[PDB]
Amino acid sequence: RSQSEREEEWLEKLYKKHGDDYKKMFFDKKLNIYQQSEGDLKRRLLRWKKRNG
Amino acid sequence: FVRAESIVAKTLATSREKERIKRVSILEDKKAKNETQHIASGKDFILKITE
Amino acid sequence: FTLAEVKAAGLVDHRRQNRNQEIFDANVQRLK
Amino acid sequence: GAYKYLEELQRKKQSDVLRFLQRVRVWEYRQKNVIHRAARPTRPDKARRLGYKAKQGFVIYRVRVRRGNRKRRSLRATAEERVGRRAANLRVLNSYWVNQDSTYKYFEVILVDPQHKAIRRDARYNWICDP
Amino acid sequence: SINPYEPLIDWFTRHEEVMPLTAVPEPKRRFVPSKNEAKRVMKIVRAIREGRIIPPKKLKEMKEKEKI
Amino acid sequence: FAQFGDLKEVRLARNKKTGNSRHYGFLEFVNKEDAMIAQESMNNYLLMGHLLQVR
Amino acid sequence: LSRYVKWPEYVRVQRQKKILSIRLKVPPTIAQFQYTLDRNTAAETFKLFNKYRPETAAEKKERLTKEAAAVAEGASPKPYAVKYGLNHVVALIENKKAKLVLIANDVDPIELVVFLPALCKKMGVPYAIVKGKARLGTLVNQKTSAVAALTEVRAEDEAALAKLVSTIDANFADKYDEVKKHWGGGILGNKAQAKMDKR
Amino acid sequence: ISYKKGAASNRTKFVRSLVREIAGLSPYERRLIDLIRNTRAKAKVEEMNNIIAASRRH
Amino acid sequence: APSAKATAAKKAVVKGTNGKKALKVRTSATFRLPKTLKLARAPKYAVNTLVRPNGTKKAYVR
RNA sequence: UGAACGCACAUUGCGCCCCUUGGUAUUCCAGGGGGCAUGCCUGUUUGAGCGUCAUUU
RNA sequence: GUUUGACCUCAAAUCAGGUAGGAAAGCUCAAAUUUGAAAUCUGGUACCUUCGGUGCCCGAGUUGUAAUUUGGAGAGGGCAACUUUGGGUUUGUAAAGUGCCUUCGAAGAGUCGCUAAGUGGGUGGUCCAUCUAAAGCUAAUAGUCGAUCCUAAGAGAUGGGGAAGCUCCGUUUCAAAGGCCUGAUUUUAUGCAGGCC
């Protein structure tokens, strides 16, 4: 089960702006358009990192 | 019958237009007497609009 | 098997209830 | 939702509002044919409870039947059978009670059109298309 | 001795409710952008990429080239 | 208000230092029963974002 | 002779119902729907409500296709519109979210809206009975709409909505709240008032 | 036990009482109210008494 | 006697100067079904003779 | 022919609409082909009703 | 504005497409807002890989068509460094499942019994026991003589009404029951106006 292109770009932006700070990615109004909990962000970002490196 | 809103709107718009005309007339009077010291602009501009 | 019997077995009739311990244990063992 | 209020209101059939409305509506009904078509349900909440959907292929007929067991058998059954005979291309889904007199009882019958594609192509209602 | 047209008495609606009827929590879809529209937009994107839907710019281009 | 009957006096409150409406005034009708009609039809008139108060 | 043939049955019944509407002594809950907003208040209400008209199907489709075409090559505020639909508006009223509710006065199954003024007054929601269900549908893009509502308004029109609510409170609520609860429809005809009121 | 005998919801009682206040009174209930002012039956008379008490002050 | 123009002004404020009605005096004695457009169908898919006793016909052609 | 479908029928009687062909043929006559039942449903188009409304920048 | 236009109800067409006559296993709706977006559907038309699909268009529909839910509850959120994936090639920050925490949590009326209730109600047991009605699905020789034409007593469709029905009554009846005529082409610019019986 692989991610989509737009999701990968969104996670790209999140990682490049905040890194591993999930609390700031949770409270960001420009990148977290659909307000998503820290757990979901961490899980999706971990999948993205595992696929890329 | 004449509704109140028509009268109020006429008064307000005519008051605005009258002030516009007074300002234009004072500016032209100042330019005519070559008293262009405390005026906004002394140049006769023309704007050409074309599609 | 009642819902309690199926749940106790690690994973069917919704009308039946459990009120006897021996029958419940026998059904749980039967499921296992 | 608004259907709870309608259901609770229709449970008081001798109150001023419903008594007045029924008095006017029964006179209005008696001027039309015995079996006529309703433009829309008179009690949409009851139609929804009985399985009516506001989509193409759902029909409502109003029918009045004489009361009494004398002649000089259920009344609802006769009403539904007459309505179904009138519209032989549809199946009688349900029916409910709208009004009554000292002479007639008035019912509204919900029918479904099996040949319409809106009923054929949805799995929730294409059971009635089977013969 | 009984008036059949007595005025209505508002014995229940005269007392305002201070707070809503139910305590249902607010869904999360009322605070974030639409999801149904997101899916519909992505469906239109997929149709555009397959050539089934001509984009509006290309359509505007085609109506300025024939009608002469 | 001359369309509701003949008027006798119409005065408006203004600022003394600069002529500017104080947003209220008084006016008198020749017919007393004309004032009642003029009051019943404009007592809650929503005009230009204002609720006229005629009494 | 038989001159009745100058009217078809449907016209005759249609006018008989009109006569029965004003001759019968209607109960207060159905009588209250004859008291509607006046010309100025109704004209000012539809100027605010016409600025929040929902997008039509074509406009919404065009707006979504522009976004799709932008995405296919390579952060928005919440929308604002008038709320409609009977169940939706009723759910909004009992949650105390509607700022103003317009109720049509000509719903054919009148029992669909009889509880609405009472629910609006009990729940502390401003309401107004507006003449014309086909006019409420114009600002909804439907043929008819039984109700309409305003839940959220743009910050430019927040003052206008408050002023409209105050105007309706002064013109509609405080004016009719004593006669609203009286039986209506006791209008006497000339041939009847001449023989009863005079005698 | 089942939900069908749980309790009465706040919205449910609200709707029932609002419909009671709006619909009016059936003729025999008007007769009962007139009689009172001057298991099914017990419940109906208690409802009429509650209506009277609520109409008086609250 | 609240003048005469005060009543008209109140009616114009409240009603709005759209009262009068236009109707025809000479109505028809009997109402008939009006004529409407009746479209045409446009489908979507498609010598002296005598009879003889033996059940046949005989014709004399001169 | 028959549930039997243009109308009738104890007659093997009487019509209407569209296209096309042939005889002196724009008018007349004939031949050939295709249509015209009722109840109901969804939709299209054309309507009726002082039934309800709105209608001064 | 004596104008113009929205709806509502009722009509018509040899209108487009249809339909009737006769002979061993469990589940699904309604009832609580998608409101940050009627997300739903018939039909016409053009193509295609045609028991269907896609694009476009006219409509139905907010007096409610989709997704979600049916006490066996269920729903909105949060946490697992939890688990899973369709169609003849898949992908959308899409659709689900399990465990725990937290906030909530509707229920079928001329119906039960003249006409109701919601810790209600139905049925049983010598206070207790058991179910959840008034909604639904589910396998095992003639132009010329007659007929043909016309109406007579009468019979009998339509409109309407009765009857469980095979059918009966009623013959112009509270039926929108159909023909004809006139016009410079119809005064905010080429969308029929008036009249007769």
DSSP symbol at G171: I
Burial class (CB in 10 A: 0-12, 13-18, 19+), G141: middle
Collect all residues of chain H within an 8 Å Cβ-Cβ radius of residue G119.
18
Beta-sheet pairing, D58-66 with D104-112: antiparallel
Work out if G134's Cβ lies within 7 angstroms of strand J. yes
User: Are B1 and F47 a contacting pair at CB < 8 A?
Assistant: no
CATH number at residue G88: 3.30.1330.30
Q: Which residue is nearest to nucleotide K40 (CA to C1')?
A: D55
Helix (H) or strand (E) run with residue G150 in it: strand G147-150
Asked if residue D41 keeps its beta carbon closer than 7 A to nucleic acid strand J, the reply is no
CA angle E19, H16, G98 (to 5 degrees): 35
Task: Find out whether E47 and G65 touch, Cβ atoms under 8 Å.
Answer: no
**How distant is C1' of K145 from CA of I60, in Å?**
20
Question: Encoding tokens for residue F30?
Answer: 């020749």
- Report residue F21 CA to chain centroid gap: 13
Closest CA to H29 of G94, H37, G101: H37
- The answer to whether A17 and A31 have CB atoms below 8 angstroms apart is yes
Confirm or reject contact between H14 and chain E (CB < 8 A). Answer: yes
Q: G47 lies in a domain?
A: yes
G45 within domain boundaries: yes
What SS3 state is found at E43?
helix
N residues, chain B = 51
Query: Which nucleotide is closest to the Cα of D58 by its C1'?
Result: J41
Tell me how far the alpha carbon of residue I53 is from its chain's centroid: 56
What span, in angstroms and rounded, lies between the C-alpha atoms of D59 and G166?
45
Distances (CA, A) of G12 to D64, G6, G17, G22, I21: 21, 10, 9, 16, 21
Return the partners of chain F (3 or more C-beta pairs < 8 Å): B, G, I
Q: Where are the domains of chain D?
A: 2-129
Size of interface B-I (CB pairs under 8 A): 6
Q: How many CB atoms neighbour CB B1 within 10 A?
A: 12
Residue G151 near residue G92, CB atoms below 8 Å: yes
- Angstrom distance, D124 CA to K137 C1': 9
- Report the Cα D83 to chain-centroid distance in Å: 10
Using the Cβ of D11 and the Cβ atoms of chain G, whether some distance falls under 8 Å is answered with: no
Beta-carbon-side half-sphere exposure of residue I12 (alpha carbons within 13 Å)? 13
Distance CA E67, CA H11 (A): 64
Return the C-alpha torsion angle E22, E28, E30, E32, nearest 10: 170
* Tokens representing residue E28 in the block: 């999360």
CATH number at residue H30: 1.10.10.1760
Question: Alpha-carbon Rg of chain D, whole angstroms?
Answer: 16
Contact, E31 vs A35, CB < 8 A? Answer: yes
C25/C5 Cα distance (integer angstroms) = 8
Q: Which nucleotides of K are covered by protein (CB under 7 A)?
A: 1-3, 6-21, 26, 28-39, 41-45, 54-57, 59-66, 71-73, 75-82, 85, 91-95, 103-111, 114-121, 130-132, 135-138, 141-143, 160-165, 173-179, 194-197
Through-space separation of residue I37 CA and nucleotide K185 C1' in angstroms? 20
Our separate counts of H helices and E strands in chain I read: 1, 2
Q: Which CATH number fits the domain D2-129, given the four candidates 3.10.20.30, 3.40.50.10490, 3.40.1120.10, 3.90.1170.50?
A: 3.40.1120.10
Asked if residue D111 lies in contact with residue D83, where contact means CB atoms within 8 angstroms, the answer is: yes
A30 to chain E, any CB pair closer than 8 A? The answer is: no
**Resolution of the experimental model, in Å, one decimal:** 3.0
> Given an 8 Å threshold on Cβ–Cβ distance, is H51 in contact with E11?
yes
Q: In what helix (H) or strand (E) does residue G70 lie, and over which residues does it extend? A: helix G57-73
Cβ contact G19 with chain J strand, < 7 A: no
Q: Give pairs for H6-13: CB < 8 Å, separation 24+.
A: H9/E22, H10/E21, H10/E22, H11/D4, H11/E21, H11/E22, H11/G94, H12/D4
Please, which positions of strand J sit below 7 A from a protein CB?
35, 39-43, 45-57
> Which chains sit next to A, with 3 or more Cβ pairs under 8 A?
E, G
Residue entry with tokens 């109409």: H55
Q: Which of residues 10-39 of E have CB within 7 Å of strand K?
A: 22-39
What is the phi/psi pair of residue B10, to 5°? -60, -45
- Kindly determine whether residue F47 and residue B8, on different chains, have CB atoms separated by under 8 Å: yes
User: Can you tell me the distance from the alpha carbon of G91 to that of E22, in angstroms, rounded to the nearest whole number?
Assistant: 11
Full residue range of the structural domain in which residue G104 is found: 8-189
A29 close to G (CB below 8 A): yes
Would you say H17 and E12 are in contact if contact means Cβ atoms under 8 Å apart?
Answer: yes
Whether D78 contacts D63, CB under 8 Å: no
Closest CA to G174 of F43, F37, I6: F43
Mutate to test the interface with I, among G14, G39, G171 (most CBs of I within 10 A): G39
User: Quick check: H41 CB within 7 A of strand K?
Assistant: no
Torsion of CA C10, C12, C13, C19, to 10 degrees: -30
CA distance A9 to I13: 62
Domain with H29, as residue range(s), is 1-58
Spatial distance from the CA of I25 to the C1' of K194 (Å): 14
Do the beta carbons of residue G41 and residue I13 sit within 8 Å? no
Give Cα G150 to chain centroid, integer Å: 13
CA–C1' gap, D48 and K32, in angstroms: 16
Cα gap G37→I60, rounded to integer Å: 94
3-state secondary structure D89-101: CCEEEEEEEEEEC
Q: Which nucleotide is nearest to G105 (CA to C1')?
A: J52
Q: How far apart are the first and last CA of chain C?
A: 12
Say yes or no for a CB contact (<8 Å) between H17 and E12.
yes
Inside any domain, residue G163: yes
**C-alpha to C-alpha distances, D29 to D34, D110, H28, nearest whole angstrom:** 8, 18, 27
Q: Note the Cα H4 to chain centre separation in Å.
A: 21
Q: Is the CB of G43 under 7 A from strand J?
A: yes
Contacts of G150 (CB under 8 A, 6+ apart): G48, G49, G52, G82, G83, G98, G99, G100, G161
**G62, two tokens:** 């065009």
In chain D, residues with a C-beta closer than 8 Å to the C-beta of G115 are 5, 9
| Strand, helix or coil for residue G100 | strand
Where b means 16+ CB within 10 Å and e means fewer, D102-114 reads: eebbbbbbbbbbb
Q: Do chains E and I touch (3 or more CB pairs under 8 A)?
A: no
CA-wise closest residue to D110 among D28, D34, D32, D55: D55
